Design a binder for this molecule. Structure first.
Ligand code: ZN
Ligand code: ZN
Ligand code: ZN
Lengths: 285, 197, 206, 285, 283
C-alpha cells in the first residue's frame, strides 16, 4: 500500500500518510532522515471552493550553518559524499545509485553479489523485485514516458527573473537531467512565486525564498544575512562525544501568556517558492 | 569604449549582411523620414528614471525642428520580438539562449508593469529636472528608449543564429499571455478635466 | 475642393490647440494620399474591385513600416473632446457614439474574417506582400472614410469638457479592441521569414 | 474595566473589557482599519518563549490611490474620514487625536447651535469626552514623570537604526501624534532586531510603506499579493475540478494561512535584556 | 420496421456491440433515416418541428433542427459536416470502427478504398460471414432512397420548379457568396438531408412572400456545413446535457422569489434556429 521507497525495503517508522495516495514516494520521516524538510499544504481560493490545496515544503536548516549544510538537495556533483552512502546499507546505496543513474555502481554491486552464497542461494528475488518496484516510480514519472501522463494541463518554470540578477539563466539543463520523479518532487515542494491564468496572473510572495545552483538546491535569501530560524528540534552519536554550542535567552515572567495567549498568532516558518507556473489559456492543439 | 561598441555593432552588421541573401531593393521607402538618426550610450540601462536621460535637454531643439510627437504611445512587444524566436534550434541540444530569453521577456514585462506604476508621480520629478511642462509628454519616449537600448545590447549577444522553420509553441504562448496584460496596462492612462486645452 | 473649404478653413483659423492638435485632417502626405476618392463604406468589408490600382501602386512600396495596431483609443479620443452647449448636444453625443459602435463592429468583423479577405484579394493580386497590402489598405480605407466624416461633421464646436460617460464607453470598447488584436494569431506560422525580418533592426538604429 | 477608545461611544467586542495598549475593541479595529489584533510566537521551542504584538494586513488587493491608505495623516485625514459620513462624536474624537483644536471648538459651538442641547445632554457628552481624553492623557510620553524606555529603540529603516541616520518615516513619526505613534509601535513588528549579542533579520522584504499621506499599502516592488477576503455586481470568479480527495493527508500536513503580516523597521536592544516588565509605559526612545 | 441507418449498422464482433442503439425514433418515418441520438453523437444537432399555418389552423408543419455547438469554439469544432475533401480528417475514421469507416467511404463514394478493404476482407472468416450481405443490404437501401428519388426525382424537381435558393440573403454578406453553387456537388443523400434539415428564411407563393426571420442565422461553408453567424460575434448558444477557470461576474441579485412571482410569464426559449434563403412554391 505504501509508496515510500523506504517502505519498499529492521524497522522503518514510515509515515502512515505515505500509504494514502499522495505520490511523494517518501515519508516525511525520511525527508527528515536525509534532507530535513517537512511536506505541507497551502489551500488557496476565491470563494473557498478551495480547488488549489497545493503541496509545499519547508526546510529546517539552522540559520548559522553555511557551506554544504545550506545545500537542500545536492546535484549529482559530489552527491556520493554529500550523502556519504558508503556509511549506508547496500539497499540504500543501490537506491541512490538508481536515482543518480549510477548504473556503473549497479553493475559493480551485481558483480560483487554474483559469487556470494547469499546472492546465489537467496535474496536475488528481493533485490530485483525491489528494483522493478522502484523503477515503476520512474515509469510513473518522466513525462517523456509514462503515456505522457505527467502533462496535467499546466507548465512550470523555476529560473524566472532572479530579481536584480544579470541577464542570463541556467541550471534547468541539470534539472531535466535529474530523474523526472525528483523534478516532480521539486514541483510538489516549491510552489511558484507567480501563476499565469487563462485570464490573468497572480503573485504569492514578494521576495525570493531559495536558489538552485549547479551544486544543487540551496536555501539562501538573495542578499544580506540569512533570516533567523531556530530549529524546531522536536526530533533527531553516543559512540563518540557529540557537542553543540547554542545561544539561549532564558526568559521569565512568561505567565503573562495568561493575557497574551487570548489573541491569535501568526506562523514563523519557511515556505519555499521559485519561478512561475502557467495554465494554458488554450491547448496548443 | 564607444569605439568598441561601434566595432561590435559593425560585427552584428556583418552577421546580418551575411545571413541576408537578397536586397529586393528600390521598393520605395515613401513612409520614412529617417533624418539624422543618433544613438546614446546604453549604460545604466538595467534600470531607469535617472536624469542622465534628461541630461540632453537640448532635445527640445530637435523636437521643435521635427517633433514626431506621438500621444499615448503604446507598445506591441509581440510584434517587435516575434522574429527573434527562430534561433535557439540552429544549434541543438541546449536552451543555449532560450533559458535566458524566457526570463529576459518576463523581466521586460515586469519593467513595463513597474514603470507604469511609477510614472504617475515621476512626472513631477522630471519637471524638477526640467520645468518645461512639455516634458510631461516627452518623458514617455524615454520609457521605450530604455528598452530599445536593451534590445540593442542584446543584439550583440546572440547574432550567430538564423530563422528556424518552426518555433516552439511555448514561446508564442508566453508572448501572447504576457503581452495581452502588457497592452491592457495602457488602458488606465487617462486625462481629467483640462477644459479647453 | 469643398472637402477642404468646408472645414480646413476653421482648422487653420484655430490657433488655440494646447493638449492635442488635429495633426492631419486635410494635411500633409504625398502621392499615396490621393488615391482615396470613392465614397468608402464602414457598413461592410471593402469591395476588392475598387482598390486594384492601389494594389498596383503599393507593389512599388514597402509596408512593414506601419505597426499592426490601430491606435483606436490614442488617435480618436482627442478628436472628440469638444462640443457646443446643450442645444443639439444630444444629437452630437448620440451620433458620435453610434459612429463609435459602427467603427467597433467594423474592426471586429475584419478581425474575425480576415482570412477570407486576404485570400480573395490575393486571388487577383498574386503579389508577394499581398498580406501587408490588405492589412494596410483596411486601415487606409477606414482612415479615408473617417476623414470624409470629419470634413462633414466639422463644426464650430468650441466648448470643451470631458464627458465621463463618453470616456467610459471609450475605454470599454478599446480594451476589447486590443483584446481582438491580441487574439489575432499574428502570422505565428509558416515561418514568415518571407518578411523583412524587422530589417534585423537595421544598423541597430531605425 | 473596558478601555476601548470607542467604548466611550453611547457595540464593542468582549475582548475590549481587558486592558490592552490597543485601546480599541477588535470590532472597531475591523470596522475602521480592517485588521485583527494578533500577536506572534517568538517561541524558540527550546524553552525560549516570547511573543510580539501584530495586526495582520488585510486591506483589499485591488484598491487604488487613497484606498491604499490604511490610516491617513492629519494632512489628509478627512479625505478618508469623510466626516459627513461620520457621527459628531467620532468627528470630535478624531479632531482631538489630530490636535484639531479649531474643529474641537467648532463642534463645541455646534453644541449650542443644536438647539436640542437645552436638554443638558451636553453634560453626558462632555463626560464621555473627558473619558476619552483620559487615554491620551495617560499615553503622553512627554509628561515630565513619564518613564522613557531603557535598553530599547525602534526605527523605520535598517540603516537609520544601525547608524542613527535621519530619514522620511522616522521624521514623520517623530512629528506624528503621540497616541497614534504609540499605536503604530504596538502594531508594527520590526524587520530586524539588534541585540548586542546578535542581529536578527526576520524578512528580506518588508510589507508596505509609510508616507507623509499615511500608512500606504504599496509593496516596494511588483504587483500586490492576493487578498482572500441592490444595484451592485458580485463579480464572482470561480474555478473547476472541485478537489481530488486527499483530505486525510492534507489535514495531516502543516497548514499555512494566507495572512499578511507586518514586517517594517528595525528594533534595537542594548546594555541588558530586560524588556519583560509588563506595566504600561509610553516607551519613547 | 426500422430505418435509421445507424440501426441498420451492426457490430462486426460481439465486443463493441451497438448498445446505446438508435432510439424508438428510428422506427418513425420522418424520412431522415437517422435517430436523433446519432444526430447528436455525430453532428451536434437536434431535430425539431416547425408548425406552419395553411393560412389557417389547418395543419401545416415542417421539420427543422437546432445545432448544439457552443458560442466559443472556432474552425473544425464549428464544422458541422465535412466535404469529401476533409471528412477523413474530421472523423479520424481509424478512431471509428471499420464498419463505420466503410459506410462513410460509401457515402463519399471512395469506392477505391471501400473495395480495397472489401478485397482484403473477402477470405476473412468474419466477412465470409454475412457482413458482406449487411453491406449490400445497406447498398440496396441507398438505391431505394437515392436512385429512386434523391438525385433523381428530387434533384429533377428541385432543378425544374420549386428550388430553394440556399443563398446569401443580402449580397453584402460576401463571406457567404454563391456557395449555394456548391450544393450541386454533394452526394444526393447528403443534399436531401441538408434540405430536410435547414429551413429557408423566406417562402414565395402566389399568396405572398413570407419572411420567417429578419436576418440569417447561418453561413454557407467552404467544405461542409459549419455553424457560424453570417455577421458579427457568434450569438450565444447555451448547452444542455476539471481544473478550469469558470468566473462569472454575475450581478449580486438579491431579488429572491423572482420565478415564484414570474412563472406565469412566457419562458422564452433560446436555442438557435436554422434559416437560409428562399423557397418557392406553386399551390
Ligand atoms: Zn517511509
Ligand atoms: Zn470599541
Ligand atoms: Zn441511429
Amino acid at each position: 500500500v505504501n509508496r515510500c521507497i523506504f517502505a519498499s525495503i529492521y524497522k522503518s517508522p514510515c509515515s502512515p500518510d505515505a500509504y494514502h495516495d499522495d505520490g511523494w514516494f517518501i515519508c516525511n520521516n525520511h525527508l527528515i532522515k536525509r534532507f530535513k524538510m517537512s511536506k505541507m499544504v497551502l489551500p488557496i481560493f476565491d470563494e473557498d471552493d478551495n480547488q488549489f490545496k497545493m503541496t509545499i515544503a519547508r526546510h529546517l536548516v539552522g540559520n548559522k550553518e553555511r557551506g554544504i549544510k545550506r545545500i537542500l538537495i545536492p546535484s549529482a556533483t559530489n552527491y556520493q559524499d554529500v550523502f556519504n552512502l558508503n556509511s549506508m546499507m547496500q539497499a540504500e546505496q543501490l537506491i541512490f545509485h538508481l536515482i543518480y543513474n549510477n548504473e556503473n555502481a549497479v553493475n559493480t554491486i551485481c558483480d560483487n553479489l554474483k559469487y556470494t552464497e547469499g546472492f546465489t542461494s537467496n535474496t536475488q528475488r528481493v533485490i530485483h523485485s525491489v528494483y522493478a518496484t522502484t523503477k515503476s516510480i520512474l515509469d510513473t514519472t518522466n513525462p517523456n514516458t509514462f503515456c505522457s501522463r505527467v502533462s496535467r494541463d499546466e507548465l512550470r518554470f523555476f529560473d524566472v527573473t532572479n530579481a536584480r540578477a544579470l541577464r542570463g539563466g541556467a541550471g534547468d539543463q541539470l534539472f531535466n537531467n535529474y530523474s523526472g520523479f525528483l523534478q516532480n518532487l521539486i514541483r510538489r515542494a516549491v510552489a511558484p512565486e507567480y501563476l499565469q491564468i487563462d485570464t490573468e496572473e497572480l503573485r504569492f510572495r514578494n521576495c525570493a525564498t531559495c536558489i538552485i545552483d549547479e551544486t544543487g538546491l540551496v536555501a539562501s535569501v538573495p542578499d544580506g544575512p540569512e533570516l533567523y530560524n531556530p530549529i524546531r528540534s522536536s526530533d533527531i552519536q553516543p559512540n563518540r562525544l557529540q557537542i553543540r554550542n547554542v545561544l539561549k535567552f532564558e526568559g521569565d515572567t512568561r505567565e503573562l501568556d495568561r493575557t497574551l495567549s487570548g489573541y491569535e498568532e501568526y506562523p514563523t516558518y519557511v515556505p519555499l517558492f521559485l519561478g512561475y507556473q502557467i495554465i494554458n489559456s488554450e491547448n496548443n492543439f | 569604449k564607444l569605439e568598441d561598441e561601434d566595432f561590435l555593432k559593425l560585427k552584428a552588421l556583418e552577421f546580418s549582411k551575411d545571413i541576408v541573401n537578397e536586397k529586393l531593393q528600390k521598393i520605395i521607402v515613401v513612409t520614412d523620414g529617417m533624418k539624422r538618426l543618433y544613438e546614446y550610450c546604453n549604460c545604466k540601462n538595467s534600470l531607469e528614471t535617472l536624469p542622465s536621460a534628461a541630461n540632453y535637454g537640448s532635445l527640445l531643439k530637435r523636437l521643435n525642428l521635427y517633433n514626431l510627437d506621438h500621444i499615448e504611445m503604446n507598445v506591441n512587444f509581440y510584434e517587435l520580438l516575434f522574429p527573434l524566436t527562430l534561433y535557439n534550434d540552429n544549434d541543438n541540444s541546449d536552451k543555449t539562449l532560450s533559458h535566458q530569453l524566457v526570463n529576459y521577456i518576463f523581466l521586460a514585462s515586469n519593467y513595463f508593469q513597474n514603470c507604469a506604476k511609477n510614472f504617475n508621480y515621476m512626472r513631477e520629478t522630471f519637471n524638477v529636472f526640467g520645468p518645461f511642462k512639455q516634458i510631461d509628454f516627452m518623458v514617455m519616449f524615454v520609457i521605450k528608449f530604455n528598452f530599445l537600448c536593451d534590445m540593442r545590447n542584446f543584439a550583440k549577444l546572440i547574432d550567430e543564429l538564423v530563422p528556424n522553420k518552426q518555433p516552439n509553441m511555448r514561446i508564442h504562448s508566453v508572448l501572447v499571455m504576457r503581452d495581452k496584460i502588457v497592452k491592457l496596462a495602457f488602458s488606465n492612462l487617462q486625462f481629467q478635466t483640462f477644459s479647453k486645452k
